[PDB]
Amino acid sequence: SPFKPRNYQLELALPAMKGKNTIICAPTGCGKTFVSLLICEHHLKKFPQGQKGKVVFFANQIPVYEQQKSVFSKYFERHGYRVTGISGATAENVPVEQIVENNDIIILTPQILVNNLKKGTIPSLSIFTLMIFDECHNTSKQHPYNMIMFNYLDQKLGGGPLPQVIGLTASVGVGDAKNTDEALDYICKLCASLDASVIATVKHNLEELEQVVYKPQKFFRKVESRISDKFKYIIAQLMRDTESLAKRICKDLENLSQIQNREFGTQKYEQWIVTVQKACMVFQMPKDEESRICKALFLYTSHLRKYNDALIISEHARMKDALDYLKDFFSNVEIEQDLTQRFEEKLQELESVSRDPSNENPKLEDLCFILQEEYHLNPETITILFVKTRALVDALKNWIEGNPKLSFLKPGILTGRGGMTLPAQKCILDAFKGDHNILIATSVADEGIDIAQCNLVILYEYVGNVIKMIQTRGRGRARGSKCFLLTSNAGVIEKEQINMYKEKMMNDSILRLQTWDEAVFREKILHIQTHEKFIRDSQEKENKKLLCRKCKALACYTADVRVIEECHYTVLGDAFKECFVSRPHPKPKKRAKIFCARQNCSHDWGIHVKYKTFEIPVIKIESFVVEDIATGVQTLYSKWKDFHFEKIPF
Amino acid sequence: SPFKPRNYQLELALPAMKGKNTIICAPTGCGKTFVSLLICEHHLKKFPQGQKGKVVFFANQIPVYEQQKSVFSKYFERHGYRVTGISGATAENVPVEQIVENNDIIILTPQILVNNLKKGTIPSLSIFTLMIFDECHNTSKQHPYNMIMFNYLDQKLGGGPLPQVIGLTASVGVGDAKNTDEALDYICKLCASLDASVIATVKHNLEELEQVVYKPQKFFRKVESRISDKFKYIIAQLMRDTESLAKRICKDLENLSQIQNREFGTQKYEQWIVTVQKACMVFQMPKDEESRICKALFLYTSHLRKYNDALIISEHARMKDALDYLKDFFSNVEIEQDLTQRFEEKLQELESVSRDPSNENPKLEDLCFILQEEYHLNPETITILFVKTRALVDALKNWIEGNPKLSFLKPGILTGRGGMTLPAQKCILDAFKGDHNILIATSVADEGIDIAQCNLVILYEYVGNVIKMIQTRGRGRARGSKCFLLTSNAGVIEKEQINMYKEKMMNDSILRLQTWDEAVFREKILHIQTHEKFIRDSQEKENKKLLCRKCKALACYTADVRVIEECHYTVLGDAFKECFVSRPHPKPKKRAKIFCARQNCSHDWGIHVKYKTFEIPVIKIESFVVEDIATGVQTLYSKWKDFHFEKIPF
RNA sequence: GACUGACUGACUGAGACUGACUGACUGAGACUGACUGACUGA
RNA sequence: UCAGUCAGUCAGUCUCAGUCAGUCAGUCUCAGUCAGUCAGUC
Ligand SMILES: Nc1ncnc2c1ncn2[C@@H]1O[C@H](COP(=O)(O)OP(=O)(O)O)[C@@H](O)[C@H]1O
Ligand SMILES: Nc1ncnc2c1ncn2[C@@H]1O[C@H](COP(=O)(O)OP(=O)(O)O)[C@@H](O)[C@H]1O
Ligand code: ALF
Ligand code: ALF
Ligand SMILES: [Mg+2]
Ligand SMILES: [Mg+2]
Ligand SMILES: [Zn+2]
Ligand SMILES: [Zn+2]
C-alpha cells in the first residue's frame, strides 16, 4: 500500500499491459518486482465476471523463491486473491493437479513444472494465461526455462489458446560476440527462444532513473605472492621424492600421458594424476605381482593428489588449513608405513613455519586491510563476500572469527541447500533487516538477494561471463556502494576489463535493435523459431566381472546385482558376504560402512542401509573395475548411467 | 420396534447376509448401527436347533461403548437373547473365560480381548462366529484391532473353524497418497489387513439417501493477531534478561544445540530448552562448584520453560490464565530470591494490562461473536466445541461461565476417564436428550457420539488427517448444521482444503476399486496377506549410582532397589532414610511427599505409599541421573523400561 | 417390658496414588540417486 | 569433438528427539446406610 508507483515502472509496464509477449531490460535495483506486481494486477483484473485466469512465477534459487513468495503474499492479501507456492521443501505435498486449480497465483521452481509436464499430470500449458520469467537471461541450450519454452513453441507451431509471456532481466547476455553484429544475432536468438515481440527499456524518464538508482563503483586489487615459501618448498621436495619413488617401480609413465611440463600446484597436474590412475589401474598383467603393482601405484598417486590439493588450498586458504586437511587424511587413512614416516618427519617443521605469522598468506592480509579500513571509515555497513567453494566458506568463517584485529565483524554464512536448510536461510536473510554485518556467500547470492542495505561487495578470485559480473556488481542497492575484485593474477584483471567492455557493447547493440520496424522483427523471429524447431526435431531419434580397484580382488558379477526402487543397487548371496568386512565401530559412528576383506586392501566399497524391513549393503560403481567375462579387456565407469547391463528389480 | 428398516440398510446388509467377510462404507449418520443390528439378528437366527453362536462388538472410547451397549440391550430384550459387556469399569469382575460362554452378545474394548489372548485364558478365537468392528478404519500398524486380526490371520494361514468378519466405517482413510494409484494401494492393503472380500457402498437408493441424510456445511474463519501486545513484550524482555543471566555463567551455550533462530513462543524453543537441560545436567566437572553450576542452570532453564508455557497459554487461552499459572508456580515453587524479585517487579504492570479489556485475545472475541450471532439467529440449538488440551477445556469452561454477554450458554464438559468417570459421562450424554446447550469436548467426541440434535460444530485450532476431518464434520446429525474452523494461521486453512480434496480423491478411488472382478480381488488380497505375514514373522526375533538431578547428591544405588508387585519401585536401608526429608504439612494435605534433604536443593523425588501392612516411600526414575560405578559416564532415563539392571522382588 | 452404651460383618457411593500401551502432531538430523550450467586442460 | 574439476536443482529411502490426547493393569483411603453380638443401669 505505501509503495507509490514511479513513472518508469508505468513506462515499462505499458507494452505488457497492451498484451504482447515482452522482455523487460532494466538496470539492477530499479524495482522490476513492482513492475511485475502491476502487470499481474492489471492483467488479472481485466477479466469479466464468471471468468478467471492463473498466474505463474518461477525462480532458480530457494532464497529468491522464498522472498518472492513473501512479497506476493503481502501485496495481494487485500484484494483477496489466493496465492500459493510449491518447491522441494513441501513434504507429502497434496497432488498439484488441482493445487494449480484452487489458487490464482502460483510460485514454483521450473524443475517442478518440467517434472509434472514430462509425467503428464498437468495436461497442457493452456490452463494458464500469464507466465512470468524472472532472471530471464538463462533461457538457453538446456536450462529448464528453455524446455518449458520448447513445450510452448512445439504446441504453438503445430495446430488451443496459449498464455502471454513476460520476461524480466538486468542483462540479456552477450554470449560470445566479437563484434556488434554477433551481439545483435545473440539477442535476436534469445528473443526468438522465448517468443517475444517487444523489448522494453526506460528512456523517457532516464533522468529520474539516475537519482532514483545509484550505480555502484568498481575497483581492482592485484596482490603479489611471496618469493620464498618454506611450506611450498618442503611440500615440493616431498613431491619430488614421492615422484621418484613412483617412477622407480613403473617401467615408464612419462610416456603414458601427453601432458608435458606439469607444474606442482596446477589443475593440469591433477588431470595428469587422474590420467595416470585411470591408465594404470586398468593396465593388466599375465598375477599377485599385478595386484601389488596396482596397489603401490594407487597409494603413490593418491598421496600425490592429496598433497596437490593441500598445496592449492594453502595458496588459497590460510596456512593452518592445509596441514589440518593433510593430518586428517593421514590419521584417518608396508609402504604406507614408509610414507607415514616421511610425513611425520617434516610435521614439526611444517607446524613451526605455520605458526610464524610473518609468512601469512598475502591475500588474507590485504582482505583484512580492506575490511579494517572500510569499517574504520564507516562503523556500520553491510558487506558481502563471494567465494568459489563451500570449503573456503568454512575456512573464511573460522579465520574471520579467529582474528582479534577484526573484532568488528559479525559473520553470517549463506549457501544452497545440500548443508543449510530453507528456514535457516530465511532466518539469516531476515536478520539482515538485527546484529549481523558480513555475509559469506556462494554462487546462490546472484540473481537478486535484495538486501536493502549493502555498501561493499568483495570478489575473492571470482570471475566469469558478463552476466555474472553485472549481477554481482548490482547487489549494492545502497548508495555509495563499492565492489572490489581481489586477485593475484593479471589475466583475471584483463578478463574483468574485457567483460566491462562486453557489457558496454551489448548495451549499445540492444539500443540498435530497438530501432527496427515492427512486423519485420516478428517475421525474422518466426523464421528463427521454425529453423530451430526443425533442427531440434531432427536432431535426435553380459554377466561380466567387477573387481576391487585397489587390490584387483574379484568383487562380484553383474548377474547378481538387483536394483531396488530403480535408484539403489545391491547384491544378494553369501559369496559377497565373505568378500567384504564391515568395521566394528564405523567412522560415522551413523551406519556401518563396507570395506575390502583383505587386511592388505583397506578400500571402502559401499555402505549399509535398511529398506522398509531389511538391512542390506549397497555398493557404488565408483569402487570397482569392470572386466569382460569373455575377453581380458577393462574399462572404468564413474557413473551408473554409462554402465549397460540387464537391470533387474529386487 | 418402532424403527422401520429403510431400503439402503437392506442393500448394505445383503453381502454380509450372504456370509462373506465384508466392509461397509457409508456416510456419517445413515444408521450403520441399525445395519449391524439387522445383520446380527439374521446371522444368529439362521442357526438350527441345538446349535448356537456368539457375537462380539468392540468400541474404542468408553461413552461409545456405553451407548452401543444400551442400544443392543434395548433392541434384543424381546427375543430373549442375553447380552452383556466388559470394560475397565467392572471391578472384581467374574472371570471372563465363561462370561463369554454364558451370554450371546458380548460388548468389549479390544484391549481386554488382547490381554486375555496374550495371557491365554481364552483358548482361541473359534469360540466366536461373528466379529463386528466399529470404526474399522483404525486397523493399522499396531492398533489393537490389527493385533486381533494378526491372531486371526496367523491362525488361518497355518492349518479349526473361523468366524465371519464385518467392519463398519464412514471413511476408510487415504493414508499418504499423492495420486489415485497410492490411494487404491492403501485401500487394498486395508482390506487385506482384515480379510474382507467385498466393499459395500449404497448406490441404487442414493436419492433416498440425500433427503434422509443432510450433509453438513463447512466454513473457515481466519483471525489476525494484535500488532502490539504489552504482556508479550514485557515477558519477552524478561526472556532476554534471563537468557543473558544464563549466558553469563556458562562458557558456551549457543554451540550445544544445533537449533538456530529460536523464536520465543514456539515449541522449537521448548525443545531447545529441553536439549540444553539434558546436555548440561549431564555435563561433568573434576566438585561443589559443579553442583552449584548445575543448580543455577537448572533453575534458569526451569523458569525459561515455565515462562514459555505461559506465553503459549496466553496466546491460546485468555489473558488472566497465564498470570494465574505463573503466580501459582512462583508461590508454590539466593538466585531464586533474585528471580522472585524480578517477577514481583513486573507483577502489577501485568495485572494492569490483564484487566484492560481492549487488549483481549482476538480468538475469544470472534468465538463470542459466533456464539452470540448464532444463538440470536436460533434461540435453541446444541453445539459442540473441539479443543486440543484438557487445560484449555477448564479455561474455556471458566471463561464461558464468566462472560455476562453469553448468558445464553449452559456448559457441559466431556473428556476421557483419567478426570471424569463413566457414570458422569453417561449422565452428561443423557442430559442432552434436559437443560444443557453447549458441549466442550476433547478428542473422545469423534467416531460417533450420536447426539440427535446438533447444529453447530466449532474447531478451535483442531486439524489433522482426513479421517479426523470427516468424523468431526459428521457430528452434525441435525439438518441445517454447520462447521466452523477458527484459526490464526493460514497454513491450517491450506491443510483443511487439501484434506477436503484428499477426501474427494479417496471417494473416487473406492468407486474405481468397486469395478474389479471377483476372485482376482481375493487373489491379490491373499498375496498381500502372505507377504505381510512373512515380513512380520521375520521382522522380530551393575550396582551403579543414582544422584539428584538438581544438586548431584548421591541418592542411592540400583543394588538396593526392590520392585514390589512388579510395578512399584522402592529402596530399604537407613542410608536412604537420611538422604531425603519429608514435608511436615505436605502440599497434597493426601500423603507425604519426598524431597531432597539439603535445604539448598528443594527437589521432589517421590511419594510415600502403604502396601498392605507397611508404609514405604517410592521414587521415580524421573528424579535422578544415573552414573556408572566404574567410569564417570552418565545418561538420563525418562522411563524405567529403558533402564536395565537386576530387577529384584520385595 | 423400655433405656443408654461399645463390637463385628456384609452392601454401596464416592475419591487420591503408582505403573505400562497405542495413535496423531511437530521439530530436527543421516543416506543413495539423477539433471543443468559456468570454468579450465589437452 | 573429448576428458577432469566446481557450483546450483530435483527424485526417492531412512532415523532420532520433545510435546499432546486417548486405552489398560495394579496398590490404597474416607464417608453414609443395613443387619447381627455383647457389657451396664432401670
Ligand atoms: N515505489 C517504490 N518506492 C521505493 N522503493 C521501491 C518501490 N518499489 C520497489 N522498490 C524497491 O525495489 C526493490 C526490488 O527491486 P528488484 O526489482 O528486486 O531489483 P532488480 O531490478 O535488480 O531485480 C525492493 O527492495 C524495494 O525496496
Ligand atoms: N429406521 C430408522 N429411522 C430413523 N432413524 C434411524 C433408523 N435407524 C437408525 N436411525 C438413526 O441412526 C442413528 C445411528 O446412526 P449411526 O449408525 O451411529 O451413524 P454413523 O453411520 O455415523 O455411525 C440413531 O441416532 C438413530 O436415530
Ligand atoms: F533482478 Al535483480 F537484483 F537483478 F533482483
Ligand atoms: F459411525 Al459414526 F458418527 F461415523 F456413529
Ligand atoms: Mg529481481
Ligand atoms: Mg457409528
Ligand atoms: Zn581391495
Ligand atoms: Zn538435590
Curated annotation (Swiss-Prot), chains A, B:
Substituting residue 533 to R results in: Decreased polyubiquitination. Loss of function in RIG-I signaling pathway. Decreased ubiquitination and function in RIG-I signaling pathway without effect on RNA-binding
**Modifications the protein undergoes after translation, according to the UniProt entry:** Phosphorylated in resting cells and dephosphorylated in RNA virus-infected cells.
Question: Crosslink site(s) for Glycyl lysine isopeptide (Lys-Gly) (interchain with G-Cter in ubiquitin)?
Answer: 550
Q: Where does ATP bind?
A: 26-33
- Asked whether the keyword Mitochondrion is assigned, the reply is no
Reported effect, residue 32 to A: No IRF3 signaling activity. Loss of dsRNA-induced ATPase activity. No effect on ds-RNA binding. Changed RIG-I signaling pathway
Q: A Gene Ontology CC term for this entry? A: actin cytoskeleton
Q: Where is this region: Interaction with ZC3HAV1?
A: 1-650
GO aspect biological process, one term: defense response to virus
Coarse class of the protein's main subcellular location: cytoplasm
Q: What is its EC number?
A: 3.6.4.13
- Binding-site residues for Zn(2+), renumbered to this chain: 548, 551, 596, 601
Keywords tagged on the record: Acetylation, Antiviral defense, ATP-binding, Cell junction, Cell membrane, Cell projection, Cytoplasm, Cytoskeleton, Disease variant, Helicase, Host-virus interaction, Hydrolase, Immunity, Innate immunity, Isopeptide bond, Membrane, Metal-binding, Nucleotide-binding, Phosphoprotein, Repeat, RNA-binding, Tight junction, Ubl conjugation, Zinc
According to the entry, the disease involved is:
Singleton-Merten syndrome 2: A form of Singleton-Merten syndrome, an autosomal dominant disorder characterized by marked aortic calcification, dental anomalies, osteopenia, acro-osteolysis, and to a lesser extent glaucoma, psoriasis, muscle weakness, and joint laxity. Additional clinical manifestations include particular facial characteristics and abnormal joint and muscle ligaments. SGMRT2 is an atypical form characterized by variable expression of glaucoma, aortic calcification, and skeletal abnormalities, without dental anomalies.
| Annotated protein name in UniProt | Antiviral innate immune response receptor RIG-I
Query: What high-level taxonomic lineage is stated for the organism?
Result: Eukaryota, Metazoa, Chordata, Craniata, Vertebrata
Q: Which gene encodes it?
A: RIGI
Please indicate which part of the intact protein appears here, giving the first and last residue numbers and the full length: 239 to 918 of 925
